Design a protein around this ligand. Structure first.
Ligand SMILES: [Ca+2]
Ligand code: NA
Length: 259
C-alpha cells in the first residue's frame, strides 16, 4: 500500500540508552528478514566516539525493550555516524573517515562488498544540519536499497542513488535542489524523498518532498515532533511502515499515514 506521506504520529519511546555513548545512534529492523532472523530482530548501535564497532542484536522485541542483547557483533572496521541500515540479512554502513559503504553479512560476520560512493562528500562536508558526520545516509524503501549524499558537482544539494544490494553498484541517480546541510535528516517512502525541518523542535515539520518517479519537488507542512530535542537519526522501515528515530538517548518510532 504505497502513497504520499500525509501524516506522522506522536513519537513512542521504545528504549532509552543509559550512558553518553548512546546520546546518538541508529536502531534498525530488517524489512526483508532472512534466517536466522525474523521481523522481531532488532539491531542497535550507540554511535558516540571514534572507534564505533559494537552492534547489539536482539532476537526479540521484548529483549530490545527490556533486556540485554542476545548477541554482540564487533565490526571489522569502525563505523561512521548514524546512517546505517539492515536489509536482507546484511548491515550496510559507512566506514569511518571514508566514503565507503560496506555490506556486512550478519549471520556469518563477513564483509560481502565494499563500494566508494562516487564523488560523495564525507566527514563533515555535507552533513545534515546537526553535524555528526552525517554526510552519507542509507535508506530502505518498498523498492530496496538507496543512499542519500551530496557531491561538489551538486553544490551540496541532496543526491540519491538506488543501490544494488548484492554488490553496491549504483543503478540510478537523482539530484534534488534541497541543500543537505539545511535539513535535519531525510528518508524515502515509495520512491519519494522526504526531509525533516529541525532536529530540536517539538514543532518541526516534514518540509520537502522529491518524487523520483516524476522529478517534481514540493513543500510540505506535516507536523513532526522531536520529543527530546536532539534527533540524530530518522529513517523509514517499509515493512512496518513506520519511522524509526534516535532522539537524545531515546529510540523512538512514529506511525505514518500514506494517501
Ligand atoms: Ca535518514
Ligand atoms: Na539511514
Amino acid at each position: 500500500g504505497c502513497g504520499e506521506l500525509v501524516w506522522v504520529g506522536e513519537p513512542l519511546t521504545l528504549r532509552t540508552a543509559e550512558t553518553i555513548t548512546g546520546k546518538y545512534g541508529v536502531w534498525m529492523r530488517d524489512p526483508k528478514p532472512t534466517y536466522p532472523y525474523t521481523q522481531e530482530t532488532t539491531w542497535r548501535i550507540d554511535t558516540v566516539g571514534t572507534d564505533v564497532r559494537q552492534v547489539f542484536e536482539y532476537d526479540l522485541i521484548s529483549q530490545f525493550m527490556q533486556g540485554y542483547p542476545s548477541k554482540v557483533h564487533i565490526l571489522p572496521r569502525p563505523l561512521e555516524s548514524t546512517g546505517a541500515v539492515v536489509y536482507s540479512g546484511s548491515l550496510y554502513f559507512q566506514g569511518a573517515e571514508s566514503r565507503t559503504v560496506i555490506r556486512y553479512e550478519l549471520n556469518t560476520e563477513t564483509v560481502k562488498a565494499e563500494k566508494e560512493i562516487p564523488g560523495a562528500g564525507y566527514h563533515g562536508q555535507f552533513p545534515y544540519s546537526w553535524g555528526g558526520y552525517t554526510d552519507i545516509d542509507l535508506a530502505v524503501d518498498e523498492a530496496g536499497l538507496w543512499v542519500i549524499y551530496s557531491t561538489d558537482e551538486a553544490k551540496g544539494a541532496i543526491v540519491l542513488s538506488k543501490l544494488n544490494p548484492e554488490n553496491l553498484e549504483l543503478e540510478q541517480t537523482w539530484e534534488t535542489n534541497i541543500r543537505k546541510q539545511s535539513v535535519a535528516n531525510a528518508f524515502i517512502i515509495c520512491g519519494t524523498l522526504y526531509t525533516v525541518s529541525s532536529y530540536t523542535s517539538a514543532d518541526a515539520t516534514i518540509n520537502f518532498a522529491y518524487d523520483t518517479g516524476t522529478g517534481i519537488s514540493k513543500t510540505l507542512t506535516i507536523p513532526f515532533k522531536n520529543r527530546y530535542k536532539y534527533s540524530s537519526m530518522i529513517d523509514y522501515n517499509p515493512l512496518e511502515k513506520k519511522l524509526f528515530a534516535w532522539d537524545n538517548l531515546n529510540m523512538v518510532t512514529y506511525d505514518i499515514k500514506l494517501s
